[PDB]
From Swiss-Prot:
This is Tyrosine-protein phosphatase CpsB. Keywords: Capsule biogenesis/degradation, Exopolysaccharide synthesis, Hydrolase, Manganese, Protein phosphatase. Dephosphorylates CpsD. Involved in the regulation of capsular polysaccharide biosynthesis. GO terms for molecular function: manganese ion binding; protein tyrosine phosphatase activity. Its EC number is 3.1.3.48. Its cofactor is Mn(2+). It is an enzyme of class 3 (hydrolase). GO terms for biological process: capsule polysaccharide biosynthetic process. It comes from Streptococcus pneumoniae serotype 4 (strain ATCC BAA-334 / TIGR4). Pathway: Capsule biogenesis; capsule polysaccharide biosynthesis. It catalyses: O-phospho-L-tyrosyl-[protein] + H2O = L-tyrosyl-[protein] + phosphate.
Length: 244
């Protein structure tokens, strides 16, 4: 019954699945791990991911149909991962790019090196539209690294935070390629700065979901209540347009 609010499951629109078959296999693995609702958040990024909205929506509806071949109770909701450039304010205000399941929440991302002042300003402007930012993979941002302050100041302003399931996991004994991101994620969890864990799944090679492993790890380290909050209860509130 996990609810995954960050995913690249739509074929032929971004760096996610290339085909219907690949979308189906990604959905199947997500379901196998215990996920029961997935929010599609394919990339909207000026200068990198600019597939027309009409094509994303059309391919999304096909993916929702494919999900029925996986399981009758797998819920597929619409959404977007919005890389912040100033044109997105008008797109959001005019409802031309999607929020998460038509709620007040929008999934927002920045670059690794985006300065804190720019993150703060962008999020403030989005809040002024009546939209609540969910900050995508906060472990990515140099500006927030080891910085409980900064993260809390963003939260206190009205934002919520999301960390990728892959970075929740322990560093592996061999072949660890993402040690620093794991370490950042570990700090955010330890300081209780994380509202949601989501997969950011793209495929079944380099970027599969790690939702079941992350759920078990959080359960072990922080208890079942925190695990339920991060993987089920907070993401459900977002999907249902309820405040956290
Ligand atoms: Mn991507
Ligand atoms: Mn991203
Ligand atoms: Mn993503």
């Amino acid at each position: 019954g996990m609810i995954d609010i960050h995913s690249h499951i739509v074929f032929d629109v971004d760096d996610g699945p290339k085909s219907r078959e690949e979308s189906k296999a990604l959905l199947a693995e997500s379901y196998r791990q215990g996920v029961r609702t997935i929010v599609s958040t394919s990339h909207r990024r000026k200068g990198m991911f600019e597939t027309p909205e009409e094509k994303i929506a059309e391919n999304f509806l096909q993916v929702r149909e494919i999900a029925k071949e996986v399981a009758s109770d797998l819920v597929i909701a619409y959404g977007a991962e919005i890389y912040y450039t100033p044109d997105v304010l008008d797109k959001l205000e005019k409802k031309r790019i999607p929020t998460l399941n038509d709620s007040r929440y929008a999934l927002i991302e920045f670059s690794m090196n985006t300065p804190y002042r720019d993150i703060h300003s962008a999020l403030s402007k989005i809040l002024m539209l009546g939209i609540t930012p969910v900050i995508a993979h906060i472990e990515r941002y140099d500006a927030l690294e080891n910085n409980e302050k900064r993260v809390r100041e963003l939260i206190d302003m009205g934002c919520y935070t999301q960390v990728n399931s892959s970075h929740v996991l322990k560093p592996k004994l061999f072949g660890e390629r993402y040690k620093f991101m794991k370490k950042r994620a570990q700090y955010f969890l330890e300081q209780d700065l994380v509202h949601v864990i989501a997969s950011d799944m793209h495929n079944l090679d380099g970027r599969p979901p790690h939702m079941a492993e992350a759920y078990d790890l959080v359960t072990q380290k922080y208890g079942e209540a925190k695990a339920q909050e991060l993987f089920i209860d907070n993401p459900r509130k977002i999907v249902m347009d309820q405040l956290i």
